[PDB]
Amino acid sequence: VPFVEDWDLVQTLGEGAYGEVQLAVNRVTEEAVAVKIVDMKRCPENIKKEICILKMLNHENVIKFYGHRREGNIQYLFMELASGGSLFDRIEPDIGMPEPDAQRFFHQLMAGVVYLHGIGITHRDIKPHNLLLDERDNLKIADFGLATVFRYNNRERLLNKMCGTLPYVAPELLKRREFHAEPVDVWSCGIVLTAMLAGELPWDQPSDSCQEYSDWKEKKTYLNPWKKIDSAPLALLHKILVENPSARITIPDIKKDRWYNKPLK
Template sequence: MVTVRGGAMAAGAEFVEGWLVAQVLGEGAYGEVRLLVHARSGAAVALKVVRGGEAGAGGAGRAADAAREAALHRALRHRHVLRCLGERTHQGLHYMFLEYAPGGELFDRIEPDVGMREDEARRYWRQLLSGLQYLHGRGVAHRDIKPENLLLDDHDNLKISDFGMATLFRHGSRERLLSRVCGTVPYAAPEVLAAAARPYRAAPADLWAAALVLLAMLAGELPWERAAAEDARYAGWLAAGPAAPGPWRRAGAGARALLARLLRADAARRPGADALLASAWLREGETRAWRSQPAGGEDGAAAGEGAAELSAADMDALICYSQPAQPDDLPPPEPGALPLGRRRTRLWLRGEPAAALAALAAALARPGLAAAGRQRAARGERRAGAAGLGRAGGRGARRLGGAHAAGVPALPRLRASILASLCRAA
């Protein structure tokens, strides 16, 4: 391991065998974050270094906090939560190896006094809520949600990072109230600032901060310095809501209505992450398409993106088969049912419909194939009343079949009809 003096690492030095130290990604009072690059493969990780070994209670406390942060962070697995890949302690320093997010901070995407386009803000905020929904479901409060702690990966997807202030607020069905004043003041909920006098619930406080992140994305500024009565702009918000002077006018009507619900002084009246994700404004512009294979969610990479990086072995490992590969996994056939194939893999390809049909017709016209197709079609016609296409799935898959509504052809007949028409076209 590279020798570290005073917590600083020289760029270009070898951290451990094969891993080179690159530029500084961020730094603070007690440490820094560096980029590590693997010399042979080019793989990159972020290395967070926390100085915690100095003599005295302060150094010991920082070391304990770093160990607690790493233990909590390593247990989290979600597409919108930055991964913690590992940790170690060496010569009084605590190292955390984190997923590298090359897109940088969300903060840098926000133009001061302008913000960003509403559709971009909506997408990032949907991803933020998805991550918070997961964290709160695991009983984890982040307690420092702000644009600087929201990173973007190489597909421009948001990742919640920096769990230095995070804590567990629920274990099983038991929820505890929090009493620590922490976070970044302009994003802190009023109950957090008053926590010394009265403990507060964790989830509504995180969602309050998320609401201010949304306003920052839409308006390019924050509405107040602190959510307390002595702040004149916050007092104006309490009196007039979105009609108060300030950045609210730069947010659309739907977003303002959502912010008015979330930025209520009474935490008990704020909606939860589930309700927010189902809100009309957040679902605006949302498109959904039926697919026979998982597409990785709306936040995944675009189809075909990154395909050049996958080897044949990678592709084989990623393909999801719509029927079991082993004959023993197949349910026993029912009387009169069509047999299931060992593998029926359905893939979506991009192309023009006319060209695709022409290519299919050409393939069906190969010697012997058209005749075999006609024979299969004839067999399908003879089985017009048969029940039996199995749903994609494994052992015990439900079957479609039985009585059919008047005028609706049985699935085997329909499939045979389509096959016959294609064979005739060939």
């Protein structure tokens, strides 16, 4: 039975490259939090950056950082517990989920992304495994290990590093030497929305050599996953998944969309 200062580490909630996440229970107060354990030896620069960004975050749709402790080579990051687990586990394969549930989660995801963008942070790996749920099914954006600053002192910096998850990544990230941060997070949110409504990802990657990607650019929406999605949400996906990032819809314009504003069950 291991432990750190006043807390005991009681079960493994997830694993991952750098380490694992444990459910941590304060023996005394009985509060329960999640602890991300990282083996600094197994990079120490990387956690310096992650903790720094983590301390900036204060929003109801973003995971909260409570503090940390270095104990020799291991860093313990104390963070909010999302006891409903992941959005990934609410998606039925080949089905999706009810449209009203998808719309609610989409609203919550936009609120968290507008918050991050407004403090000049980009997440860079939005996908259902990184979107967690509290006990009342409120969404929380999680995993800031690839996050970075894109605006500082009111001045934007373009990105150049390749990163993320291929099926969710925007096409400019594969084709351009440097690109703007915000339209890349908007694109990944569009892939999430397709997942929630269809239970299927549309392509392996958004390249000219991928047939499924070519089929979309040729507007063949009688094919899957598109043919499973109602016309109203499909019209929003046509404005998000636009190849040219400067023609792609922005978040203030998403908030004006017809489906975004439709009252549902």
